[PDB]
Amino acid sequence: WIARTFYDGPEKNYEKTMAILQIEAEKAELRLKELEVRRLMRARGDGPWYQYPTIDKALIDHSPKTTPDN
Amino acid sequence: AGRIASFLKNAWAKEPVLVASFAIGGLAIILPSLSPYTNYAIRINRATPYNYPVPLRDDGNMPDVPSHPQDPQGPSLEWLKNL
Numbered sequence: 293w294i295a296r297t298f299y300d301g302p303e304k305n306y307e308k309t310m311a312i313l314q315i316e317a318e319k320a321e322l323r324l325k326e327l328e329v330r331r332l333m334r335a336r337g338d339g340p341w342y343q344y345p346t347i348d349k350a351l352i353d354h355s356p357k358t359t360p361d362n
Numbered sequence: 363a364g365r366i367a368s369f370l371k372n373a374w375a376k377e378p379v380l381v382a383s384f385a386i387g388g389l390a391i392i393l394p395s396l397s398p399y400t401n402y403a404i405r406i407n408r409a410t411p412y413n414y415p416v417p418l419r420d421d422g423n424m425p426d427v428p429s430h431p432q433d434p435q436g437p438s439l440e441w442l443k444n445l
């Protein structure tokens with residue numbers, strides 16, 4: 293009676309544990325991958341991250357400058 | 363309208379320097395936007411050649427660009443002479 297009205301079967305806890313373990317393992321793998329990607333992006337500068345501004349080339353004036361040699 | 367006229371009349375007495383100052387300053391602020399010669403002053407400033415006019419490479423597609431200074435193409439300064 294106690295088992296029938298207060299508890300469930302073993303398979304429920306078993307499969308809930310499986311799902312929880314899958315989620316946690318995926319999160320750990322993602323954390324490691326994110327750290328490695330951050331290291332590579334900061335070292336190389338070839339990714340979307342750690343982009344530091346340079347002078348906009350639209351500010352340059354392309355006209356004759358009263359002197360032939362610029 | 364009576365109060366403003368009374369204030370102006372009372373200020374013109376016993377304070378003419380300030381009245382003249384404000385009148386001249388306001389006129390200097392207002393008149394340039396109404397004068398038609400400010401555009402002429404801008405045009406005169408534009409027509410003063412400080413730099414060398416660098417010629418353009420002709421490709422047969424520029425009829426508006428003269429090939430000699432005496433050619434009738436290009437901007438004119440007859441209006442400046444008539445001023």
Ligand SMILES: CCCCCCCCCCCCCCCCC[C@@H](O)O[C@H](CO[C@H](O)CCCCCCCCCCCCCCC)COP(=O)(O)OCC[N+](C)(C)C
Nearest residue numbers: 293294295296297298299300301302303304305306307308
């Ligand atoms: C002959 C009898 C011998 C044995 C006597 C047994 C005595 C039993 C008292 C001990 C109770 C144990 C505590 C249980 C509370 C937690 C369990 C909980 O999960 O059960 C809930 C049920 O809650 C219970 O109703 C709680 C009972 C607590 C009340 C105790 C009774 C006496 C208290 C006195 C109250 C005040 C009296 C008035 C004074 C003026 C339903 O939850 P649920 O997630 O769905 O379960 C899923 C499993 N399913 C599928 C089977 C449903």
Ligand SMILES: CCCCCCCC/C=C\CCCCCCCC(=O)O[C@H](COC(=O)CCCCCCC/C=C/CCCCCCCC)COP(=O)(O)OCCN
Nearest residue numbers: 369370373374377380381382383384385386387388389391
């Ligand atoms: C909108 C134009 C603004 C730009 C022009 C400004 C040019 C420079 C003028 C500003 C300089 C500083 C002005 C400081 C004002 C101080 C006023 C003040 O406190 O003086 C009062 C006295 O003056 C006053 O009463 C207050 C101001 C009076 C009105 C002044 C003129 C207001 C507008 C009149 C002209 C309007 C336009 C003219 C149109 C006429 C038609 C062309 C007290 O004087 P006391 O030294 O204490 O001596 C008193 C005891 N004997």
